[PDB]
Amino acid sequence: PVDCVRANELCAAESNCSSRYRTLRQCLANKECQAALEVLQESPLYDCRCKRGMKKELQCLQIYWSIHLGEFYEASPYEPVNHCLDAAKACNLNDNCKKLRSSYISICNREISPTERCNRRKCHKALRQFFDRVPSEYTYRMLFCSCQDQACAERRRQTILPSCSYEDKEKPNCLDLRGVCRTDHLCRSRLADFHANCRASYQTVTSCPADNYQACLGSYAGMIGFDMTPNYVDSSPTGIVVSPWCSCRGSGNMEEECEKFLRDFTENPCLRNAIQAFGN
Amino acid sequence: LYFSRDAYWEKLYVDQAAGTPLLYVHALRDAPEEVPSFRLGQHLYGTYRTRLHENNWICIQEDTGLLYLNRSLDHSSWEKLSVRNHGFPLLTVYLKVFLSCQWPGCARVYFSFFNTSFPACSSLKPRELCFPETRPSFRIRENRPPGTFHQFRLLPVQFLCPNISVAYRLLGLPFRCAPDSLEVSTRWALDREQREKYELVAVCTVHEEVVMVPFPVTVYDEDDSAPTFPAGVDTASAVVEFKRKEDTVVATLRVFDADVVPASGELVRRYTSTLLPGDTWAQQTFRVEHWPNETSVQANGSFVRATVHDYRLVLNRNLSISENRTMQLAVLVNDSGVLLLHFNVSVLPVSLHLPSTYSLSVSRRARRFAQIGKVCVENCQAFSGINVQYKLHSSGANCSTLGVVTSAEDTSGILFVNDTKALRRPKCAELHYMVVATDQQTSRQAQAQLLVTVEGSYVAEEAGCPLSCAVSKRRLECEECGGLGSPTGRCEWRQGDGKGITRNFSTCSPSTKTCPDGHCDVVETQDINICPQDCLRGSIVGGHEPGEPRGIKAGYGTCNCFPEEEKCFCEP
Ligand SMILES: *[C@@H]1O[C@H](CO)[C@@H](O)[C@H](O)[C@H]1NC(C)=O
Ligand SMILES: *[C@@H]1O[C@H](CO)[C@@H](O)[C@H](O)[C@H]1NC(C)=O
Ligand SMILES: *[C@@H]1O[C@H](CO)[C@@H](O)[C@H](O)[C@H]1NC(C)=O
Ligand SMILES: *[C@@H]1O[C@H](CO)[C@@H](O)[C@H](O)[C@H]1NC(C)=O
Numbered sequence: 001p002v003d004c005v006r007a008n009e010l011c012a013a014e015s016n017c018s019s020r021y022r023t024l025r026q027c028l029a030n031k032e033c034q035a036a037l038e039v040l041q042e043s044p045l046y047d048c049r050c051k052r053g054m055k056k057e058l059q060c061l062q063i064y065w066s067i068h069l070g071e072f073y074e075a076s077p078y079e080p081v082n083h084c085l086d087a088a089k090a091c092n093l094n095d096n097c098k099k100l101r102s103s104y105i106s107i108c109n110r111e112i113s114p115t116e117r118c119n120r121r122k123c124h125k126a127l128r129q130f131f132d133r134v135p136s137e138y139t140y141r142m143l144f145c146s147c148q149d150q151a152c153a154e155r156r157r158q159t160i161l162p163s164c165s166y167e168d169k170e171k172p173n174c175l176d177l178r179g180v181c182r183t184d185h186l187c188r189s190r191l192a193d194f195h196a197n198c199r200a201s202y203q204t205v206t207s208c209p210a211d212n213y214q215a216c217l218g219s220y221a222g223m224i225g226f227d228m229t230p231n232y233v234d235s236s237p238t239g240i241v242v243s244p245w246c247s248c249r250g251s252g253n254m255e256e257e258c259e260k261f262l263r264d265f266t267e268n269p270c271l272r273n274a275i276q277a278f279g280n
Numbered sequence: 281l282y283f284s285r286d287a288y289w290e291k292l293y294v295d296q297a298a299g300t301p302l303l304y305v306h307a308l309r310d311a312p313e314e315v316p317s318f319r320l321g322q323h324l325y326g327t328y329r330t331r332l333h334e335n336n337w338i339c340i341q342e343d344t345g346l347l348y349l350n351r352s353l354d355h356s357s358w359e360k361l362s363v364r365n366h367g368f369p370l371l372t373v374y375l376k377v378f379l380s381c382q383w384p385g386c387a388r389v390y391f392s393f394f395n396t397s398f399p400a401c402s403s404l405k406p407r408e409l410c411f412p413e414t415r416p417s418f419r420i421r422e423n424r425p426p427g428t429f430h431q432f433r434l435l436p437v438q439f440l441c442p443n444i445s446v447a448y449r450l451l452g453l454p455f456r457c458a459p460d461s462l463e464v465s466t467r468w469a470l471d472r473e474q475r476e477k478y479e480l481v482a483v484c485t486v487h488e489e490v491v492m493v494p495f496p497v498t499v500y501d502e503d504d505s506a507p508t509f510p511a512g513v514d515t516a517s518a519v520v521e522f523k524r525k526e527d528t529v530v531a532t533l534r535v536f537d538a539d540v541v542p543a544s545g546e547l548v549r550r551y552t553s554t555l556l557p558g559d560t561w562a563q564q565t566f567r568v569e570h571w572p573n574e575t576s577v578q579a580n581g582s583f584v585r586a587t588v589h590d591y592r593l594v595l596n597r598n599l600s601i602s603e604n605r606t607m608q609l610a611v612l613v614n615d616s617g618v619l620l621l622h623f624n625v626s627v628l629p630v631s632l633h634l635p636s637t638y639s640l641s642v643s644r645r646a647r648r649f650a651q652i653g654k655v656c657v658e659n660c661q662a663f664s665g666i667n668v669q670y671k672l673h674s675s676g677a678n679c680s681t682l683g684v685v686t687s688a689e690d691t692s693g694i695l696f697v698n699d700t701k702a703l704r705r706p707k708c709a710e711l712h713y714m715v716v717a718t719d720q721q722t723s724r725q726a727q728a729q730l731l732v733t734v735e736g737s738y739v740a741e742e743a744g745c746p747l748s749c750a751v752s753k754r755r756l757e758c759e760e761c762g763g764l765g766s767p768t769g770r771c772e773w774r775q776g777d778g779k780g781i782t783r784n785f786s787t788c789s790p791s792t793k794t795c796p797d798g799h800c801d802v803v804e805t806q807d808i809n810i811c812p813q814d815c816l817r818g819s820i821v822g823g824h825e826p827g828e829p830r831g832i833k834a835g836y837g838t839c840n841c842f843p844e845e846e847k848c849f850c851e852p
């Protein structure tokens with residue numbers, strides 16, 4: 001398994017491979033394209049992955065999407081691997097979780113104007129830095145904690161602090177938000193990571209591919225801190241339905257694909273069964 | 281010509297013989313000249329747009345639209361094709377079908393392969409003998425000549441198990457299931473503008489099990505609806521009188537359209553609003569903002585959706601006071617049907633006169649920077665984008681005591697004591713000022729009289745007094761000493777509650793209507809000793825919550841402040 005950084009390392013160590021890589025990069029960014037394709041289908045850049053929380057993930061993804069030829073699903077460039085009161089108490093007794101926790105809270109709970117509720121990009125940056133370098137027995141315990149009443153569900157909803165990040169003035173079109181997320185490098189890669197690990201299945205007994213709860217939970221929590229950042233819909237104790245901040249309105253004749261894209265978050269038996277079995 | 285769906289589904293096994301019929305396709309025409317041809321893509325696609333090999337086992341009948349098996353299968357070909365999946369488990373392949381990969385120009389067909397061979401007729405449940413896993417969902421245009429778009433039977437199932445008695449059945453509906461041929465057709469041409477959805481229950485019957493399966497039908501739209509007024513409204517009268525800001529929604533109207541087809545990507549490129557020219561003042565001071573919104577309307581007890589466009593009219597700059605005009609604006613609307621709108625706009629000027637004499641008083645015990653009175657235009661809370669500044673002109677030019685600064689929120693000026701000694705003199709006891717109300721953009725101005733009486737006595741303060749009111753902590757030391765901002769000469773004490781962290785925190789202020797107001801005005805922000813609990817940028821010791829730009833928004837217990845160190849304390 002060769003990641004794209006070392007694939008560029010072996011690419012820059014050779015003359016023909018670098019020539020065909022820069023040739024295809026000048027093609028994308030007939031006959032010049034097809035020869036570069038039939039050469040670089042044997043490159044170490046061909047089928048290179050990236051890692052979660054690796055150093056210079058952005059360059060790895062910019063290299064990986066550079067060789068990609070120009071669509072509901074895409075290939076993931078990654079390695080295919082009171083209760084909530086007690087979760088917060090287990091965080092605040094460690095030192096690494098406490099510092100970054102107070103970091104994203106003291107950033108995201110700063111009202112600026114009576115119009116601007118909070119700063120968006122710094123709050124997303126703090127949430128990404130929280131959900132990258134914290135051990136996952138702390139994140140999953142605070143974000144997924146089994147509740148029986150309304151106050152526990154409200155604490156669990158308020159954990160990613162949706163008053164700044166999740167909600168907006170309007171609910172835009174889900175397809176437009178998908179286009180915005182697929183414009184950016186990082187959000188498109190996290191969305192493909194979520195699509196590769198959290199589809200429904202008719203063959204496996206838990207409707208999840210490879211019967212892997214862990215990959216679908218990591219593909220869920222890796223979408224926090226982007227524009228396609230989901231959260232719960234209400235403070236329901238047992239009813240657990242996640243959703244991004246959009247809706248099916250404004251769809252036109254593209255209504256069915258919008259509904260099918262939204263049913264990945266609203267009506268996934270794989271993700272809901274994974275959350276329920278993790279709560280058990 | 282258009283494909284009825286975009287995804288057909290089929291299950292495969294090992295060692296199925298050649299000549300086995302796999303499935304049917306359907307491609308409904310649009311004009312009475314169109315014959316559905318069917319050509320196949322020359323690559324067995326794997327997963328995530330990956331070519332495996334050219335198709336060499338599945339052939340097609342263009343007339344009946346019959347996908348069937350050209351050759352047979354084995355373990356060797358499938359274990360060969362599973363290698364080129366590049367680290368992924370072989371679960372589903374798919375082919376591309378052209379007709380003359382996206383709907384309706386192309387259609388991809390799925391194949392879910394099993395490494396085991398074909399199981400027996402009795403070893404399969406009738407639910408897996410009637411319908412596939414993927415329940416269908418169709419795409420149908422409005423107002424087109426109908427035909428046949430679906431067939432029920434599973435062809436390798438009855439090809440390999442013909443002895444199972446299986447029937448299919450549909451339940452003023454245009455759809456129908458034919459006898460002796462299980463194709464589904466539609467009687468008349470349909471429209472979304474009557475009804476958009478048709479969900480049905482199809483019944484399979486075996487020997488013995490009766491299986492009900494949902495059957496959704498979706499109708500698509502064309503641009504068959506010109507823009508329409510809600511009820512006769514073609515004009516909108518509006519007056520630009522007091523706001524005159526860079527941007528304020530002047531006029532607003534709605535336009536109905538049952539056309540949805542120019543969706544949000546191409547919605548700008550089709551629904552066109554055009555301000556008709558004629559005056560450059562309009563083109564420098566006006567514009568038209570436009571956006572739609574989907575609403576749900578009833579047709580025959582159903583709920584379809586349509587577009588309600590909203591046209592609003594927006595200013596472009598700060599209009600000055602000297603505008604005394606009126607216009608009529610004409611708006612073209614293109615729904616690519618041609619609609620016209622009008623707007624009677626009237627921009628009326630503003631009078632800036634004031635009441636002539638502001639008779640008022642001031643106590644002698646007051647200190648520096650203490651609020652007294654308010655100078656304002658007759659319409660205080662009408663100005664939005666017009667800057668109005670206030671000044672003074674002392675008559676004798678020897679008894680300068682007071683000043684006026686202007687808050688741009690209310691665009692109004694507040695009296696403040698500037699000097700103590702001139703108020704302390706018994707000579708300058710009744711003072712006459714010319715309050716001149718000026719302007720910035722256009723130099724129209726006015727003036728007025730200010731009579732003020734220096735009234736009362738003077739008493740010295742205590743020996744250990746600080747300079748601000750908020751230094752005291754108890755109630756008695758607050759009122760027995762005089763700070764800076766109060767016009768009473770003594771500091772005032774407001775007393776809160778024991779309800780935890782509240783806005784009602786007990787404190788010592790200069791004025792109980794000015795200092796813990798929650799707003800840091802122009803008077804308090806001059807020198808930071810007046811009201812530290814509304815205007816500081818510092819640190820707070822105690823359970824609290826700070827203000828939104830600055831200040832103490834809520835505290836606990838008693839709250840005092842040292843403005844010399846920018847520090848505050850809150851404690852019962
Ligand atoms: C569209 O109409 C709905 C009706 O409830 C309303 O909630 C929504 O705010 C409207 N959006 C716009 C942009 O007018
Ligand atoms: C505006 O113009 C009209 C034109 O007749 C005039 O009567 C009116 O006095 C003008 N407005 C002001 C404030 O002078
Ligand atoms: C509306 O737009 C179409 C598309 O360009 C154009 O052909 C048509 O002339 C326009 N309508 C008018 C009244 O100009
Ligand atoms: C707008 O001005 C025109 C000009 O004569 C007038 O006919 C029309 O009635 C006015 N609109 C309204 C709503 O009065």
Ligand SMILES: *[C@@H]1O[C@H](CO)[C@@H](O)[C@H](O)[C@H]1NC(C)=O
Nearest residue numbers: 525526597598664665666667
């Ligand atoms: C319009 O007036 C407001 C009032 O304060 C001012 O802040 C703004 O800069 C002005 N803008 C223009 C374009 O004149």
Ligand SMILES: *[C@@H]1O[C@H](CO)[C@@H](O)[C@H](O)[C@H]1NC(C)=O
Nearest residue numbers: 672680682683684685698699
């Ligand atoms: C207040 O008095 C000082 C000193 O006499 C002077 O500089 C200042 O301009 C006065 N304030 C106003 C608003 O004129």
Ligand SMILES: [Ca+2]
Nearest residue numbers: 422471473504
């Ligand atoms: Ca129609």
Ligand SMILES: [Ca+2]
Nearest residue numbers: 505537539615
């Ligand atoms: Ca229309």
Ligand SMILES: [Ca+2]
Nearest residue numbers: 502504538539
């Ligand atoms: Ca229409």
Ligand SMILES: [Ca+2]
Nearest residue numbers: 794795799814
């Ligand atoms: Ca104040």
